[PDB]
Amino acid sequence: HENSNSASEGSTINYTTINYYKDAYAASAGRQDMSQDPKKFTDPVMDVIHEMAPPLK
Amino acid sequence: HENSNSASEGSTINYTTINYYKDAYAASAGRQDMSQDPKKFTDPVMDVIHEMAPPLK
Amino acid sequence: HENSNSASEGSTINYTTINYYKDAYAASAGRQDMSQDPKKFTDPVMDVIHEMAPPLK
Amino acid sequence: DPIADMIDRSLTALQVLPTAANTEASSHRLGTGVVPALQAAETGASSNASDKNLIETRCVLNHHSTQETAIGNFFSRAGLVSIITMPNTDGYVNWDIDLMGYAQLRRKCELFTYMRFDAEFTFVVAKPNGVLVPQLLQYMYVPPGAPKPTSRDSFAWQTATNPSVFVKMTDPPAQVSVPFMSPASAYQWFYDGYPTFGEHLQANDLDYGQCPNNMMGTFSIRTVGTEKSPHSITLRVYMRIKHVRAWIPRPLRNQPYLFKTNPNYKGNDIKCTSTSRDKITTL
Amino acid sequence: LLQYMYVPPGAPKPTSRDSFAWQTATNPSVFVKMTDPPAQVSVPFMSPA
Amino acid sequence: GIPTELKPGTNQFLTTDDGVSAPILPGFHPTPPIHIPGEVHNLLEICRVETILEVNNLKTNETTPMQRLCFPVSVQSKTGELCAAFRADPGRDGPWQSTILGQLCRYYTQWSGSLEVTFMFAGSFMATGKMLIAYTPPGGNVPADRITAMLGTHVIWDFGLQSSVTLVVPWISNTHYRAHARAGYFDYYTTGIITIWYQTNYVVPIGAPTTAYIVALAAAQDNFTMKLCKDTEDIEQTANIQ
Amino acid sequence: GIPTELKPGTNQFLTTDDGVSAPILPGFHPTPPIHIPGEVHNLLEICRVETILEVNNLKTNETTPMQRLCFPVSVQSKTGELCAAFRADPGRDGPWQSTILGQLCRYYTQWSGSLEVTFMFAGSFMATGKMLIAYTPPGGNVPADRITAMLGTHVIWDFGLQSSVTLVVPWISNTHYRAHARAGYFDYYTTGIITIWYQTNYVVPIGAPTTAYIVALAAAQDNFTMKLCKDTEDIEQTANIQ
Amino acid sequence: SDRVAQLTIGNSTITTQEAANIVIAYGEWPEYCPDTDATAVDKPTRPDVSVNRFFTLDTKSWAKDSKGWYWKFPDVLTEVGVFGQNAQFHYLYRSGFCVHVQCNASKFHQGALLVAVLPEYVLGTIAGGTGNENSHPPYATTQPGQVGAVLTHPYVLDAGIPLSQLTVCPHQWINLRTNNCATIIVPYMNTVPFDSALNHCNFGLLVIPVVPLDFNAGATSEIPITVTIAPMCAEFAGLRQAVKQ
Numbered sequence A, B, C: 001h002e003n004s005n006s007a008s009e010g011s012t013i014n015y016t017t018i019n020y021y022k023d024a025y026a027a028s029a030g031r032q033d034m035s036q037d038p039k040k041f042t043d044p045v046m047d048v049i050h051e052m053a054p055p056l057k
Numbered sequence D: 001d002p003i004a005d006m007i008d009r010s011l012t013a014l015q016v017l018p019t020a021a022n023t024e025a026s027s028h029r030l031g032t033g034v035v036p037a038l039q040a041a042e043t044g045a046s047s048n049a050s051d052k053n054l055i056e057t058r059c060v061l062n063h064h065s066t067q068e069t070a071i072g073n074f075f076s077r078a079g080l081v082s083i084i085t086m087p088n089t090d091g092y093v094n095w096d097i098d099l100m101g102y103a104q105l106r107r108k109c110e111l112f113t114y115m116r117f118d119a120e121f122t123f124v125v126a127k128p129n130g131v132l133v134p135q136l137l138q139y140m141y142v143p144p145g146a147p148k149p150t151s152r153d154s155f156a157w158q159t160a161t162n163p164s165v166f167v168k169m170t171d172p173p174a175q176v177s178v179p180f181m182s183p184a185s186a187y188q189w190f191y192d193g194y195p196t197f198g199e200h201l202q203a204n205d206l207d208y209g210q211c212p213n214n215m216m217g218t219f220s221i222r223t224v225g226t227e228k229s230p231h232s233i234t235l236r237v238y239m240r241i242k243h244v245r246a247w248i249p250r251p252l253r254n255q256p257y258l259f260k261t262n263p264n265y266k267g268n269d270i271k272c273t274s275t276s277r278d279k280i281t282t283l
Numbered sequence E: 001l002l003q004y005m006y007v008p009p010g011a012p013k014p015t016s017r018d019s020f021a022w023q024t025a026t027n028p029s030v031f032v033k034m035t036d037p038p039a040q041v042s043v044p045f046m047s048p049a
Numbered sequence F, G: 001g002i003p004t005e006l007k008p009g010t011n012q013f014l015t016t017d018d019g020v021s022a023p024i025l026p027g028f029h030p031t032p033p034i035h036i037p038g039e040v041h042n043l044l045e046i047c048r049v050e051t052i053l054e055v056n057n058l059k060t061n062e063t064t065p066m067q068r069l070c071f072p073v074s075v076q077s078k079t080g081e082l083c084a085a086f087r088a089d090p091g092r093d094g095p096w097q098s099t100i101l102g103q104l105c106r107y108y109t110q111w112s113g114s115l116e117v118t119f120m121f122a123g124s125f126m127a128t129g130k131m132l133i134a135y136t137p138p139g140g141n142v143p144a145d146r147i148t149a150m151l152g153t154h155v156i157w158d159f160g161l162q163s164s165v166t167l168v169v170p171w172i173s174n175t176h177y178r179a180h181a182r183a184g185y186f187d188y189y190t191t192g193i194i195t196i197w198y199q200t201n202y203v204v205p206i207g208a209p210t211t212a213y214i215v216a217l218a219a220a221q222d223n224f225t226m227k228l229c230k231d232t233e234d235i236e237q238t239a240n241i242q
Numbered sequence H: 001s002d003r004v005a006q007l008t009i010g011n012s013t014i015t016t017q018e019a020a021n022i023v024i025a026y027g028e029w030p031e032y033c034p035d036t037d038a039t040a041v042d043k044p045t046r047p048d049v050s051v052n053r054f055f056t057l058d059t060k061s062w063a064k065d066s067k068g069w070y071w072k073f074p075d076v077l078t079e080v081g082v083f084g085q086n087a088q089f090h091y092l093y094r095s096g097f098c099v100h101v102q103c104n105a106s107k108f109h110q111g112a113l114l115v116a117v118l119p120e121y122v123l124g125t126i127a128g129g130t131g132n133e134n135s136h137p138p139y140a141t142t143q144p145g146q147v148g149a150v151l152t153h154p155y156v157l158d159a160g161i162p163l164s165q166l167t168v169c170p171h172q173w174i175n176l177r178t179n180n181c182a183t184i185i186v187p188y189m190n191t192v193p194f195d196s197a198l199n200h201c202n203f204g205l206l207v208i209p210v211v212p213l214d215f216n217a218g219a220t221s222e223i224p225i226t227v228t229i230a231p232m233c234a235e236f237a238g239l240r241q242a243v244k245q
């Protein structure tokens, strides 16, 4: 196969990349993932807050 | 197939070489082997020496 | 297929020739055969001569 | 069996190591008799003491690859071997094939004793100031024993058998592949002895170290036309090394080179191997 | 700009730079420039014997 | 035929590019290989072989360079003197430039793993003594006395029948790899200071000489690795060869 | 279309390159082949056919070159004389240039295998004698007498009904192949010296002539091979043909 | 219990009571040439007793300021014994070796020797001092015979490579406080399976004093060094009359 040496190998992007050489960083970018996690930036709070209840009672 | 004439045919390297011509020395280098033998350079000694015992007793 | 028109078609050479056109004389040479017959040039003699016996007795 | 007299081992085998070896955990130790810290360098074997036998270590899983240290990746890089100029003045040059003319590739290849490889040659050609002029050129490789061209329009330029390339100056650079072509089983960069028999004297003292298994003939270029071209030409030759196998490593040279054929050095300024300092106690 | 033309035995030959034989209605011919890579063709075995 | 386009990167000569080229000799066959002993498959097999370290690289030893391989140890009147000190950078100039490891690290840039330093006593048989060999992680300078230097990793050496001891220099660094250390900004990649101290005195009886020597050998451990090949600067070509 | 790039090696005309070219005659058909006897499939079938060796290539035989194919043997008064000597290099100039093997080796560079040399007596019927044909491996010069030359490989020949003997020259060399030997450095690839000596005298009765001749034929054995094709230097073109 | 050793081959026997271990160079035993690698067609000759034995060369004198000595192989054995005769009457040879160096001193001396076997040891000159002469070593320097020659600039080994990394070759130490001998077993290492013995020299043996010899006045000031060698699996081929060189 190819000696896999890229920047994104642990958690990677989609499997449509094209390559003709033996090193994996020569490959194209391809199309990207649609994965996202918002709640570790918009809700970094220990005790969970519900939208219905008062948050400070 | 191809009339095999390379420099490394007896003990060779990995099977990922690309070639379009009929002679095997026109082919690419490819990726290499990971094989190594250190003990014929670091321990060229007839009687085996263990790391725990005294070596000169 | 191709309308076969080469110089060597009756007794031919190896089957590794490459061609992209429709005429067979456009094809490559390829690798050759290892066949040879020495005895019709070194021994053109009716009565068979053995190497052990005297040849003129 | 009328005569009872007539009827009558490798050390270590190789294995693959993709990554560097891990480090296992350890603790302290108090005991007598067993000692890994004491060695004996007199036997010519190197020491086998690891990290865990001297201090206490944790567990470390490393994934450092050893790919860049292979001999294939160390040598497969094109390096300069020749500069050939046509001011020689008759439109052709005959250059003897000797790959020891530039010190940066000579030092790497002299690290091993015996080598076996296939090459790949590339010719980059322009005027002596980098200028480009449309011009037709011809390269011809002459094996040892073949006749050589003596003029710009000799009969040797018909190339009925010889491999040859025709290329222009405005084109991309030419590339060829050369197989392993020695009469012996491997090239050697050192040959201790004389090539011929008979008496060795002071007239034949220059024969020492010239092995004929490395002399590969000559190399000839010319401008194609039968007249005198009005431009100065300069050729640069680059060589890659493929399918490498090597044997019997050597110490590396620490003195600057003097000639292409012998390891002679300058005898007055013997260069010390390390850069000197003032005191032994102060770095 | 250059033109090559192969004339089989029996065919008429061009006698001038602008003759009617240069129309190449049947003859194999190549048109190639000086700055180009060199031309290449393939010829089969064509003897009566 | 098939429609194509040429992309950027056309007609360039890349020296480290790997491709397929046309051959010049069709049907050629090489000489068949024979078994020759001592085949090298990897450059890390050479880096585990110990070579001699040039500790005593003084300015007065440039005209008699056979003395730079041995550094002396003599009878002291006081206690706790230090005998030698040097940096543990295998890539920086200094004592490590004379090794087969120090010359092979110059062809690369980044390295990782642990080292080892083997000392060998070469005095008489009746002589004795004890030495302390310490390795100090960076942050401090060379220690002024023994009671500062014993805080780092250290091994106490005893002369006797076994005349060799190995101080292993363990890999303690913040990054996974280390570049070649130098004065300026690249001293961030420094690795420490190795000193050596008199544990006791060097005691000799009557009739045996009072001055002995110590040779020092250096090698690499099994988890050693390198990357990013470059050229060395130890060699040069100013004048044309031949 | 498909993205591509052009690599180095573009637009070059390599003379030994094998590729596919465009045809000029679509639908053409050749003349059908007939069976013609004597087809050559390989050039080694010619190298096993013996041709005449030119042993007697003296400077006085340049105006009467029919005598260079036969060398004489006469009645001697002394014992142990030598009659001829030459080198066994098939590629070097000299007696081997007149053979079909010596002309076919010039189109190559390296050769291997064993040879053979066949001698044929062409004297009268009543004449007799014995000859010694020796082949000496390199290291020494031509031997001064018979008792030095009999140490190498040698065969004793007897005249009679069978008038032909074959001295086989076995392949004894350090390398697998041999280049073309020459004065200078390439005499390292030399292969030996072949001499021929009087074992007994050449005895003839009354009425039969006292001078006979010997022709010499040369060929190759079955393990002969060649490689690395080049051009010969025996032919030239100084003036233009026609 | 491994400090004593005994080596016997032929009709000779070497014994030692303070010995280090045995070094096999590159971990390969010497052996006869197999049929897969052979190229010569003549049947080889094996004397197998009269050439596989210990031969003792001359004895050098270790002073307080010595430089070092070297011997070229197998030039040292080409004029002695029946091995000196089979190497003169043939064209090809092939043999391994087994080197044994003895040097003994008392418990009141000190010093250290570095023995090493170096293949393809090509010597050089100082190029006329200033470096502009294309000098060449004479025949007496490159092939000294069974006497051996001394070194001039031992820091560069008279070949441009430093002493500091000579231990990459197979090697041992003779430290005067522990042992008194060193022994290496060398196989046959060349690009061709057979070679001439008069025009090719395979390896060189180097004995270089790293730590100088020192003693107090009154002790035995005469320290000798003696080298003893032995071929292992000698074969010969290609018979021809005697040519010495």
Ligand SMILES: CCCCCCCCCCCCC/C=C/[C@H](O)[C@H](N)CO
Pocket (backbone or CB within 6 Å): D097, D098, D099, D100, D119, D121, D139, D140, D141, D163, D164, D165, D176, D178, D187, D188, D189, D214, D215, D216, F024
């Ligand atoms: C059209 C192709 C022309 C190029 C022909 C190149 C063939 C010659 C390749 C020689 C391979 C290396 C042989 C010896 C290398 C060194 O010059 C010698 N060892 C000198 O010591």
